[PDB]
Amino acid sequence: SVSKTEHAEINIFSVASGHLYERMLNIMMASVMHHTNHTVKFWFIEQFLSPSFKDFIPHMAAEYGFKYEMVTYKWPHWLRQQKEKQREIWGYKILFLDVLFPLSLDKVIFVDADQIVRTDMYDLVEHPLDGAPYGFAPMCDSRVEMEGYRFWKTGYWANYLKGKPYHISALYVVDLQRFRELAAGDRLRQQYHALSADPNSLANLDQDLPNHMQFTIPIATLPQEWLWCETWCSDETLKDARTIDLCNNPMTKEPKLDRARRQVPEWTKYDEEIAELARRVRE
Ligand SMILES: *[C@@H]1O[C@H](CO)[C@@H](O[C@@H]2O[C@H](CO)[C@@H](O[C@@H]3O[C@H](CO)[C@@H](O)[C@H](O)[C@@H]3O)[C@H](O)[C@H]2NC(C)=O)[C@H](O)[C@H]1NC(C)=O
Ligand SMILES: O=c1ccn([C@@H]2O[C@H](COP(=O)(O)OP(=O)(O)O[C@H]3O[C@H](CO)[C@@H](O)[C@H](O)[C@H]3O)[C@@H](O)[C@H]2O)c(=O)[nH]1
Ligand SMILES: Oc1ccc(CN2CCOCC2)c2cccnc12
Ligand SMILES: [Ca+2]
């Protein structure tokens, strides 16, 4: 149990760029802590964060009882860069899983900055991966009225997948030991570097890459309840949702904070609690 003592029982990493995504990142962290008594450590992709966020994180850590660490990893010069900040951030989620964390960490979970956690994240740590270096929840099929927007159900993806699930990259558990054993980081970087020579390829960089590689870098398909997003998932399955992603709805184009307040009743509770912690530190 070197990993649990040197780090924590639950290790979550996330990426956030912008005050809005940093405001949601604090909410995500509070939601994790309200649903677990296991030790938690949050790991942040440091260079995207504002100076205010990095100043506030020790206050969140002391109030909620978690450890944290800033990871500053530099994009290798050989590896095809991303001009768009959104795509650069996606690259940080999926391309460096073997080099961002210390070798003494055996497991890490990516949880999106805009997520609301309603479960003990140690259940994901304990989830059997059957030898897969990582596990992702599938994209919901349950909201039948959104079938026209499920690009992965027809065209190039339906032919490529051969019936395999097209997984959502909002949440994923990485068994770092197995990822290292399989050199999945080196292989993901190489396939990304070859694929990205075509600027039309990997439209959803962080999502398309592990879905493309799932025949050779296995994905343990997580239970559907691990990731619920209103765009693709039915209202009836929300009560089972372990975590919620505020994923974009191509039909309604509803703003981010509106989706948060409308779908998640405890969202303002976390937002106000974190704002109350900020006014308590300020005075
Ligand atoms: C984190 O740890 C706390 C403290 O152990 C957990 O709270 C405890 O949860 C149990 C299970 O619900 C409670 O026991 C039961 O409580 C009900 C309601 O009073 C009572 O009718 C039953 O007879 C039984 O005693 C326990 O009271 C409660 N303790 C406190 C201080 O709230 C909490 O559930 C843990 N959270 C996680 C995510 O593990
Ligand atoms: O830190 C961030 C993240 C996103 N955005 C912007 O927000 C917009 C929409 O992105 P986002 O809110 O991330 O969309 P989601 O639908 O929530 O993203 C889903 O789909 C992405 C891949 O397409 C995955 O990376 C996510 O985990 C998954 O939730 C874009 O302009 C992003 O550049 C930011 O400004 N800052
Ligand atoms: O490795 C791949 C990369 C990109 C795409 C297409 N993208 C552009 C439109 O949105 C979906 C993702 C693929 C489609 C099918 C199979 N493999 C793919
Ligand atoms: Ca999201």
Residue numbers in the entry: 1191 to 1473
From the paper:
For example, the envelope glycoproteins of many viruses are exquisitely dependent on calnexin-mediated folding, a process enabled by the action of the ER endoplasmic reticulum enzyme UDP–Glc glycoprotein glucosyltransferase (UGGT) and the ER alpha glucosidases I and II. We could not crystallise the GT24 catalytic domain of human UGGT—so we used crystals of the GT24 catalytic domain of CtUGGT (hereinafter CtUGGT GT24) instead. The sequence of this fungal UGGT has about 70% similarity and 60% identity to the ones of the same domain of the two human UGGT isoforms (UGGT1 and UGGT2) so that any ligands found with the crystals of CtUGGT would likely bind the human enzymes too—paving the way to a medicinal chemistry program towards modulators of human UGGT activity.
In the course of an X-ray crystallography FBLD effort aimed at the discovery of molecules binding the catalytic domain of Chaetomium thermophilum UGGT (CtUGGT GT24), we encountered crystal polymorphism: the majority of CtUGGT GT24  crystals belonged to space group H3, but some crystals lowered their symmetry to an equivalent P1 pseudo-rhombohedral lattice. The best hit was a CtUGGT GT24  2.2 Å  H3 crystal soaked in 5M-8OH-Q. The molecule is bound to a conserved patch on the surface of the protein. Diffraction data from this crystal process in H3 with Rmeas H3 = 0.323 and in P1 with Rmeas P1 = 0.206. The CCP4-Dimple/REFMAC5 Rfrees are Rfree H3 = 0.227 and Rfree P1 = 0.2537. The compound binds to a conserved patch on the surface of the CtUGGT GT24  domain, about 15 Å  away from the UDP–Glc binding site. The morpholine ring is partially disordered in the crystal, but one of its ring placements is 4.2 Å  from the conserved 1396DQD1398 motif coordinating the Glc ring of UDP–Glc; the ligand also causes a displacement of the side chain of CtUGGT GT24  1346Y. Through this displacement, the 8OH-quinoline ring inserts and is sandwiched between the aromatic side chains of the conserved residues 1346YW1347—which we propose to call the “YW clamp. The two aromatic side chains stabilise the quinoline ring, forming an aromatic trimer; the 8-OH group of the quinoline also establishes an H-bond to the side chain of 1402H.
